[PDB]
Structures are given as C-alpha cells and as structure tokens.
Design a binder for this molecule. Structure first.
Ligand SMILES: [Zn+2]
Lengths: 143, 60, 115, 141, 49, 103, 107, 54, 70, 56, 145
RNA sequence: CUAGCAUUUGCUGGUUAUCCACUUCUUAGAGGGACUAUCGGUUUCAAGCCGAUGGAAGUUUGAGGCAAUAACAGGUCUGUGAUGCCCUUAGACGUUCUGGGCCGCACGCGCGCUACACUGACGGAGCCAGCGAGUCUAACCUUGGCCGAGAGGUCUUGGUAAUCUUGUGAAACUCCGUCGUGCUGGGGAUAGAGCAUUGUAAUUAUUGCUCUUCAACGAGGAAUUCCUAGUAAGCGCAAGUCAUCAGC
C-alpha cells in the first residue's frame, strides 16, 4: 500500500533509518563526535558514542517531513530538556545550536532536506522518496 | 444547602393567592407565566420563584 | 604574567597587555576609558618622574577603586580610598590585571566575644 | 456529495475534531493509524469506541481526527469520545434509530460515561497560597 | 550637578507624586501602586473578580 | 506466573484477608484517654486492606534491589494465602489483637 | 474617479460594549441601505488588561491583593464602497468612547 | 502606538484632567468632566454648579 | 549480600542449570539467588533468551519478565 | 459641624434622594479625633447596585 | 553475550597517578577516583585511547593503561581543546594545563598563597576561613566541619 | 495546484486571498438552559435532608468580586504639593557629586529552594498546554541564515500584534538503552582556572557557560502548618520587578 513515515512507529523508524545512514556512511559526521554533549543543560555526553549523530539526523529527517518548514531554533527547543541548576529549581534550556546546524547541513549534502523560502528547511522531493522507501522497507521488515 | 430565602417564599405565596386559577403543577409553563404577570428584573430569581411556586402547588 | 617577563611587560603598550589579560579586563578597555583614568595616569607618571633614585614616588590619592592595574603603574604608590581613608599600596608586579579596590578593604573584621 | 459529520470531543483543554465519511474503513489519528498512540496503556482507551459496539459497523467509515491543545492524557480522552460521538452522529442521520440507540446503550452501560466534557475545570489559584485551596505556611512562633 | 540617569529607579518616577518606589510600568502607566488604586476607576480599571 | 490463578482473584483474596474486622478508637472523658474496641465498616476494611498492602510493598521496595512490581506481587500472594510474612496480615492481626485486649 | 470601488477595513476599538455594538450595528445597517458589499462585524477576542497590586499602601496586615481589569473590545467591518459613501458612513457614527480607524486595502 | 497603550493613555489623560480641574475650579463648584474624541477635534464638558462666573 | 563482578565459569554453569528450573525469572531473582551483578544479570537474561532457554512474557526498558521454557 | 452636616443631609434628602450619608472624621477643637455619622433615609451597601445607584 | 574470563587476568586494584583505582567499576567511573579527572574528562580520555567504555577497569591491559596515563598528562597533544582543560592560561607561564593527582592540592595551595602574598580581598578572606564569593554569612555556614 | 508512496478511486503532505462553499471546532454578540427538575424514602409528613434516574451540570452548579452596625489609641507622617504642631534652614537634617554601606558574622528564630535515590539518576528517542507581554522616533518581543563546545556573536526579516515572535513543539511524563545498592553513577555545597553577556562601573565572585574540586544529608527530636475534587501534592510557563539579576 501507500506507506508513509506516519504509518510506521516513530521509534522503529529512527532505529532503522539510523542503521541505514551509518552502514553506507555517506553522511558527513561533524568532527566533534566524542567531545560535545548536545545541550548546555546536559550533564554527560551521549552513551551511544559510535553513532548518535546518525540518530539525530534520523530524527530531523522524520521531523522535517511532517512539519512544513522547521529551523535550527525550533530544533534547539525540541531536543533541549530541563537543566538541573544544582540547588536552584529547574528550567528549560534550548539545545546545542551548532550540532543541530551541522545535521541540517549534513542532510542537505545527501539531499534528504533542502532550503525552503519563507525561512527554514523543508523536506526535499528526493527526501520524500528516501523516507517513504525506508518506511515501506521498515513496515515489511518487521512482521 | 438548598433553603429558599424570604423573597422566594414571599413572592411564591403572593402569586398563588392571585393565580391559583391559572398555573399548574409543572415548572416549565410557570416560569414562562411569571415573565408576563410579574415584573422580575433577574432571570435566576424568576426560575427560583417559579420553582417554589411549583412546590406549593404540589402540596395544595 | 602569563609567560611575558617583567622587563618585556614594562615596555609593552597598554593595548598589548590587554590582549593577554582576562575577559573582564579586555571588555573594560574595549568599552573605552573616560577622561578621569587618563588624568590619574598623568599624575602617576609625573610622581614617578619626580622621585629620587632609589626612593618610592609620592603617593597619588584616588577614589577610583574600579581602576585596573596596568604595567605602567608598577612601582607607583597609590592612595586607594576605602570609604573613610586613603590606604597606601605600592603597585607590585603580582597585582597586574586586578582592580585597585581589591587592595583596600572597605570594612573592619568582625571580632565577636572580646570587649 | 458523500455523507459528512463534523463531531468533536474534549477533556480539559484538548479538542479532538473528528471527520466521519462513507468510507472503506480507516480509523486515523492526526494522520496516522490507531496503533500510532504512544501512550502504551492509553492505546486501549481510544480503542474502546470501536471495540465495545461491533466490528461490522467499522467496515465502511473513514474516521480521522485532528487533535489540538491539552496534554498527553487529555489527548487520548478527547479523541476517544470524538470517535464514539462520530459513529453515533453518523448513525443518527443515515442509519435507523433502533440501531443507533444500541450504540448509546452498549457504550453508556459499561460504566464508560463518555458523556461529553467531563465538566471538571481547574479551580483558580487565589492569593495567599501556591494552590486554590492550599495556603502558605503560617508561622505562629 | 548631574550623573547617568538612563536606566534604573533613579530615572523612572511617578507622573503624580514623584516617588521612585513601587511604580507600575505595565502599559506605560508610570503611576505608583498607591496612586493607581486612587485613580484606578478614573483611568478605566474597574474591579470585577 | 507464580500462582497460575487469575491475578484479579488473587488481588480480591488479598483484600478480603487483610481487612481488619475490629479496631481500637481513642475515647477520652475529661483529661484521660483510653482505647475502646469497635467494629470496622466494610468500606473501611477495603480502604485499610489496600493501604496496608501498598505501604508494605513500598517499604519492602525502599532501598532494595527488588522492584515495586515484584514486592507488590509478593505482598499480594502472601496476603491471599493468609501468610504471616505479609506486612498487611501482620498489621491486621496486630490491630485485632490490640482490639481484643481493649474490649 | 469617485465611482471607483475601494476595499476598506473599518476597525472599531472601545472599552464600552454597548456603544461599540450600536456603532457597529449602525455601520452594517447603513451599508445595507446603500446596497454595499459588506463582510459583517468580525468580533476579535477581547483583550483583558490585568493589573494586580497589594491592597495596602504599607507593609502591614494580611497579604491581600486586588486585581483591576480594563477590557478592550475590538471589531472590524470590511466594506467595498466608493470614496464618497465611505466618508459619509464614518462621519454619521462618531459615538464618544468608540475609536474608529479606516484602512484602505492596498495589496 | 498600540491600542493596549492608547486606551490606557486616554484613561490617564482623563485622570490628569479630572484632578487638574478639581483644584483649579474649586471655588467655581466643579462636578466632573467628560471627553468626546472625534477625528478632528476633542470635545470636553466641564459640568459645574456656578456656571455664571466660570 | 555479596554480588558478582566478573562472570566466572562456576557461576556460568550455575546460571545454565538453575535458571531453567525457576518458574519466574527477572533481574532481581538472579541477584538474590545467584549473588550476581545486576548488570551481569541483564546480560545473562539476554543470552538465555537467545538460546531459547527462557521465554519473555513482558519486555519493558526498566523491567524484563521471563518464564522457563516449558 | 452639626448645623453643617444636618444642613447638607436635609438638602439632599429633599431633592428626590432615596437615602444619604455624611461621615466627618478628624480633629475638631479637642485633641483626640472622632468620627460622627449623619445618616438619613434608605441606602444599600453591598453588591453591584452600589456601582449602579449610589454616588460616593 | 556471557563470555567467561580467566581469574589471573583481572586486576582488582590498579595504581594510577599515585592513586588506588577499583578494578570492579567501569573504566569511565573508576578513573574519577583520580583527583582532577571528572566523568566528562574520563569519558573523553577513554574515547581518545580507543578503549571500550563498557569494559571494567580491572580488564585493562597495561598498554591501554599507559595510553590513558599519557593522554591524561598531555591532553593538548591528543587534540583535546583548551576550553576542556582545568587550568587554562596559567598565570606564571601563559600555557594551558590539566592539573591531576596531587598537583591539584598543590596548585590550589599555590593560587591561594599568591592571593595572600598580594593581599587581595579574596586572599584575606581565605586566610580568615570566610566565604569568598560574596555569600551572606549571617545565616549560612554555621557549623564548621 | 503539486510531491512521494501505491495502482483502486487512493492514502500522506506543500501552495494561509489561485479559489469557491460552509461556521461543526475557534472567536464574542444576542438569547436559551437549572428551579434540587422528576420519582422513591424520612421527619412538627413543615422547612429540609438522604437515595435513584434523567441532564452539560444536582457539594450555595465551581470560583471570586462587592460586603451592615461598629469598634482598635492595629499599620502607614519613608506613597502623596493630604496635613497640625515642633525641630532644622547656608559649615543645612534642603539639594547635588565621589567613594563606601544597607550584603558586613561566635550565634537564636521565621518563610523557602535542593536533596537523601531503583516508583530513581543518567543517555538517546517520542512530544503535548494554558494565561501572557511586546518598539517610532525607540532600540521593544525576535523568526530564518551563517560563526561558536557552550554561553553568546553576527547578517537580515516579521510584528504597534487573534496576523510576526508562537503551534511560546514548557516541564514532569512516554518509549528503548546505560547503572546495581555501595554516600554509589544519589546529593551538588565549598573551592580553583578560563571564556562571554548587561552596564559609566561588576572588586565584596550581577548573571550565564566549560573543566576541575564533590562537603553535609541513609527520611529528620520536642513541636507544628496547609488541606475535602480537576481539590491536595508533583510539574514546569508567563507576568510583576527588570539595563542586568527568582530559590519571591
Ligand atoms: Zn504616585
């Protein structure tokens, strides 16, 4: 049938379409990788280590598909959780601005995403193909 | 609780004295009558008046 | 001071010293100095020039506790106002990049018990 | 044109606007199936509209829901009743009443009480405490 | 005979009485909280709930 | 998995077994207070049963490797069997014994 | 030149609902009387300006607060009309405490 | 200027006027004031008892 | 209670013998009865599952519940 | 005071007024201050009708 | 993935940079017993040493251990940014360092003694055993310990 | 109109006036609706109360606002060009400038924030509110792009606002991972070094960010506070103050 990203679960899509991108290895990893922790309001950096940037691009792909025209600021806000201020009470802190920007550039080089007018990054026509292809694949994968 | 004040219980007795002919043992028609014959400013009080009026008519 | 030896520090321009200094020092100089700092620097220079060989220069009094210690000031005696007195401090090399106010306590230590 | 009903539901600030049609048999949410409800437990509370009534009536109706406002568990309950009001508003117009009452009978007799809005709104915080009823701690001594 | 007065409580004073303390700036009122309650209904701020 | 019985039935049996039949109330007559034995209403039995089970399970899970799901399952199974290992049964029997002493 | 039909938005703002409804009703009725194309009075959400102060002018007493409200009611009416008729409609409906703005729609 | 700011400023205009006339027209017996904002002009009406020697 | 940090051959052989006998199998059961590490216990369960010795009833991120393969 | 207060109260109450009140507070010849009231007729105190009818 | 290990290979106690490290703990946390090494630093060092983060500290080969120590001592050489180091632009030399082990307790002492010698307000407060960062001392810090 | 998946028309999205038609959802303007309605119990068969069924709702329908006669030597002369008297009035107790102080610490009390962990911390992923406020001659809320580990920087743009910020993609929570009962990876005080931001000025750390340092505290004695349904409690957000600064 006419499968979409929406017809598959969001967890199993990201796990599959991450495993797509890292295996072929066409994606541009930034160089920071082992250093950075992905938010101001994170304590430690990611536990996955060999990966994670692939999972982020797998999210941002799925996210930009469904929404109309997202930017970096909206992505910052999306991923960025609540900082423990030790002894003060918590508050929402927006996530790392560069690393979400490097993902938007990384997905543009493959051509999953493109630069939209009226600001932000819309999903591309080759994007829709690639995401709908893995969507139909991931549906038929599990039984 | 639901205990009615003087103005409810007073004006109910005052209507029934004049219009025991006319009025029924049913709320809906009574409230619509109370608009014409009595000149009430409020809407909520009218529904209170007519409700006790019905309680007395049930006893009669 | 951050590698640079003292002979070199004394020859260095204020601008080049600022490049080596902490963020707060840099930001202050980048915002500009008013006429009041410049007048004080002129007085320090005059006092240092008028000093006999091997004597400490005459103490220059200032209310500017917010002034930063620059290499040019080394060896000068500065009377730093604490709120009621001008305390006298000689600008040693170790004091570079600090505020004048740090070397003049505004309050008297709290001693409990003892009459 | 095809038959159309524009039913809705609500709990708290959630407002789940359903659209039912003469369809093939899709029961959609936002733009995704009923298995796309990430509240793992509260899958079964948006199931109940189509479970406890009859499968057969859900074989010719395109239900799809556009949920806005509220919070995660208020989304579940808003959708639910917009489904369970959708078929009843469909069966009102283009089906027999004696059938349409067996929808309402089978629903309301389960201790469902879909009703409409569960009318419980938040009681305002008033000055002198962190809550509505709760007051700041008093000192005495 | 004067010093910076661009921001802070020294800049902003009440229209009515010239007090710095307890100002209401919201909606560009610049009336001290006391004076506001005096001239609240006159302005058009009426209590309801 | 542990009883091969309908676990809803086990919960019901646990609640019926842990509900105290007699309790003591504090009665005082101008200064001094004694305990008086009194009968417990069915709604109170159900309320106390549920409270005792959930408190016992929570204390057993506090600073222990066992999860709250496991300790609650253990507490319910023990209560359904009427085992004196259960916190809820121990407390019910303690209350009834104290009631009998202040009759 | 005068007969050129212009698309115009009349915006009505007021604190007093009764006056604002009267003015709004009069504009709509006058537009009907002259057979003008009208998009009717769109009621915008009422802006509630809220100021919360301490009741007391000093420190004393229970910490009691007063909340004052000013309610701003806003409406707009879109009309397609020649310039002459528009000037006539606006002048007739000046009621004290109703603010009336007229915007010519240039795309 | 915004409508939230403008209506509030017309409020403070009234309030400044009311307090002005109160102490100015003390002897002349000032009741109150009302203002009618038109496009061109701004009408004002000093209501007062002693309307002769005002 | 003592808890294992390294796997250890004698403990491995005990896991294989004892875990199929247990009617209820979870992370806690291994820790209590087999003086094992909590995270050795999670690895052990994933191994025994792969070998088909134990059947999963319920898999949650925080709680995994297994039975013996009857 | 009493001539002045009763003076004004009666002037109000004559011309159509359903009720009236006058309170005078402060120092008046004595050191300690006092608050005399000069009510007449009928007036309500609570609710929305205050805003409608009574002029403070 | 149960894989049995020989009992001779595992080191229960490792001695690193003059500190005793527990072999039973995962490497990333084991290394935090070393003064100057925190969780984020340890993680970075392990990733730069190409050591698995899931391994226990007692399973480390001597070669892996030496590589960890070298990376800890000379972090700038292994492309660790200056901003990640614990002592940036040292006041004596102008160079970036990451003080470790005992050096910490020393470098701390040195920083203070400097402030005491200078007679800076902060140094004087440290001398008197008072809080230095503008904290209100009327209510706070009432028990020494 | 157009893009992909799929052939079965489809299913899932762009293009907010290319356009038409509706007003269910949304807005707010008139009106309606609830009166304990109707029935069954229980009482001076009164006021009422309790049960059951309808109903949007049956605890004054939920919450406030307004709130009598009066009082108090309650608080406020440091809100006021509201004010009596007294004091002071050029070396001022007027005013203004510089710097300090209000924060100063053996200690006693009050409101709070964060905690003591496995119902938890940590990492990835999922991903949902409502009330707000916002600059014209002023520097206000800020999108998008680009630089930065981060804090921030920077080039432009929308918005005088149901339009733009903003769907304020808030937090807890939800899933799949990582730890394993140890002051532990719980806890984040104290402390060192560095890099930004606001400001004439940050030293007696304004504040934020990075690394490092990693204390007490293993559920709190005598006492004692708040609280009966969308309530208690958990949870974050806006506003006020605000150049900057929230544990309020
Ligand atoms: Zn004022």
């Amino acid at each position: 049938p006419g499968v979409s990203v929406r017809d598959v679960a969001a967890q199993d899509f990201i796990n599959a379409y991450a495993s797509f991108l890292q295996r072929q290895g066409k994606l541009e990893v930034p160089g920071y990788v082992d250093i950075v922790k992905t938010s101001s309001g994170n304590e430690m950096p990611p536990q996955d280590a060999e990966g994670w940037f692939y999972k982020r691009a797998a999210s941002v792909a799925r996210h930009i598909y469904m929404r109309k025209q997202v930017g970096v600021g909206k992505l910052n806000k999306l991923y960025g959780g609540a900082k423990s201020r030790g002894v003060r009470p918590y508050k929402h802190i927006d996530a790392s601005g560069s690393i979400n920007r490097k993902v938007l550039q990384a997905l543009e080089k493959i051509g999953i995403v493109e630069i939209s007018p009226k600001g932000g990054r819309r999903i591309s026509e080759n994007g829709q193909r690639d995401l709908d292809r893995i969507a139909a694949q991931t549906l038929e994968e599990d039984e | 609780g639901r205990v009615r004040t003087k103005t409810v219980k007073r004006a109910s007795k005052a209507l029934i004295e004049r219009y025991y002919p006319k009025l029924t043992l049913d709320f809906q028609t009574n409230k619509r009558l109370c608009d014409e014959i009595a000149t009430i400013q409020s809407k909520r009080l009218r529904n209170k008046i007519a409700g006790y009026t019905t309680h007395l008519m049930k006893r009669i | 001071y951050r590698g640079v030896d003292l002979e070199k520090l004394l020859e260095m321009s204020t601008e080049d010293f600022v490049k080596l200094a902490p963020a707060r020092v840099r930001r202050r100089f980048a915002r500009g100095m008013t006429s009041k700092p410049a007048g004080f620097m002129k007085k320090l220079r005059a006092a240092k020039l008028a000093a006999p060989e091997n004597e400490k220069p005459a103490p220059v009094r200032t209310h500017m506790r917010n002034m930063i210690i620059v290499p040019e000031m080394i060896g000068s005696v500065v009377g730093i106002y604490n709120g009621k007195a001008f305390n006298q401090v000689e600008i040693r090399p170790e004091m570079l990049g600090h505020y004048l106010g740090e070397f003049s306590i505004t309050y008297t230590p709290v001693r409990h018990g003892r009459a | 044109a095809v038959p159309s009903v524009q039913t809705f539901g609500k709990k708290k600030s959630a407002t789940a606007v359903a659209h039912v049609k003469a369809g093939k048999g899709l029961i959609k949410v936002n733009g995704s199936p009923i298995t796309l409800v990430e509240p793992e437990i509260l899958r079964f509370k948006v199931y109940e509209p189509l479970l406890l009534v009859g499968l057969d009536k859900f074989s010719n109706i395109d239900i799809r829901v556009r949920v806005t406002g509220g919070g995660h568990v208020s989304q579940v309950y808003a959708i639910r009743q917009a489904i369970a009001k959708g078929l009843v508003a469909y069966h009102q117009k283009y089906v027999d009443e004696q059938s349409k009452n067996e929808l309402k009978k089978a629903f309301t007799s389960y201790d469902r009480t879909l009703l409409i809005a569960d009318s419980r709104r938040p009681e305002p915080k008033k000055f002198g405490g962190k809550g509505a009823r709760s007051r700041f701690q008093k000192s005495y001594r | 005979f004067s010093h910076p007065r661009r921001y802070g409580k020294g800049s902003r004073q009440c229209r009515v009485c010239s007090s710095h303390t307890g100002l209401i700036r919201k909606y560009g009122l610049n009336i001290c909280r006391q004076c506001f309650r005096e001239k609240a209904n006159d302005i058009g701020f009426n209590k309801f709930r | 998995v542990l009883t091969d019985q309908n676990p809803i039935q086990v919960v019901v049996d646990a609640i019926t077994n842990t509900g105290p039949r007699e309790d003591t109330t504090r009665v005082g007559g101008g200064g001094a207070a004694r305990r008086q034995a009194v009968d417990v209403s069915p709604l109170r039995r159900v309320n106390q049963a549920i409270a005792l089970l959930t408190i016992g399970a929570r204390e057993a899970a506090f600073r222990n490797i066992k999860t709250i799901a496991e300790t609650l399952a253990e507490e319910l199974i023990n209560a359904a069997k009427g085992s004196s290992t259960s916190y809820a049964i121990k407390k019910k029997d303690e209350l009834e014994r104290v009631a009998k002493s202040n009759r | 030149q005068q007969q050129q039909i212009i698309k115009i938005r009349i915006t009505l703002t007021s604190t007093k609902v009764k006056q604002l409804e009267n003015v709004s009703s009069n504009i709509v009725k006058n537009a009907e009387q002259h057979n003008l194309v009208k998009k009717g009075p769109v009621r915008l959400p009422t802006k509630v300006l809220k100021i919360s102060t301490r009741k007391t002018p000093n420190g004393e007493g229970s910490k009691t607060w007063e909340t004052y409200e000013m309610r701003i009611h806003k409406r707009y009416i879109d009309l397609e009309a020649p310039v002459q008729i528009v000037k006539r409609i606006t002048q007739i409906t000046i009621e004290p405490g109703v603010d009336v703005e007229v915007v010519v729609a240039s795309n | 200027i915004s409508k939230k700011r403008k209506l509030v400023a017309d409020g403070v205009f009234y309030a400044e006027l009311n307090e002005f006339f109160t102490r100015e027209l003390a002897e002349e017996g000032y009741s109150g004031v009302e203002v009618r904002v038109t496009p061109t002009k701004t009408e004002v009406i000093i209501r007062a008892t002693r309307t002769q020697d005002v | 209670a003592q808890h294992a940090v390294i796997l250890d051959q004698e403990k491995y052989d005990r896991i294989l013998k004892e875990v199929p006998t247990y009617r209820y199998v979870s992370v806690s059961v291994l820790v209590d009865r087999l003086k094992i590490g909590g995270s050795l216990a999670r690895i052990a369960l994933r191994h025994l599952e792969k070998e088909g010795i134990i059947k999963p009833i319920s898999k949650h991120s925080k709680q995994a519940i297994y039975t013996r393969a009857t | 005071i009493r001539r002045a207060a009763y003076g004004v109260v009666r002037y109000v109450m004559e011309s159509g007024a359903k009720g009236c009140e006058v309170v005078v507070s402060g120092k008046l010849r004595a050191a300690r201050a006092k608050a005399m009231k000069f009510a007449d007729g009928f007036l309500i105190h609570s609710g929305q009708p205050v805003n409608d009818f009574i002029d403070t | 993935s149960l894989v049995v290990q020989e009992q001779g290979s595992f080191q229960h106690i490792l001695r690193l940079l003059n500190t005793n490290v527990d072999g039973n703990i995962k490497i990333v946390y084991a290394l935090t017993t070393i003064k100057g090494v925190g969780r984020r630093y340890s993680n970075l060092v392990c990733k730069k040493a190409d050591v698995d983060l899931h391994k226990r500290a007692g399973e480390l080969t001597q070669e892996e251990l030496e590589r960890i120590v070298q990376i800890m001592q000379n972090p700038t050489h292994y492309k660790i940014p200056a901003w990640f180091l614990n002592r940036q632009n040292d006041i004596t030399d102008g160079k970036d360092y990451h003080t470790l082990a005992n050096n910490v307790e020393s470098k701390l002492r040195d920083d203070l003694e400097r402030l005491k010698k200078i007679r800076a307000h902060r140094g004087i407060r440290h001398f008197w055993g008072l809080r230095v960062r503008g904290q209100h001392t009327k209510t706070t810090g009432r028990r020494r310990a």
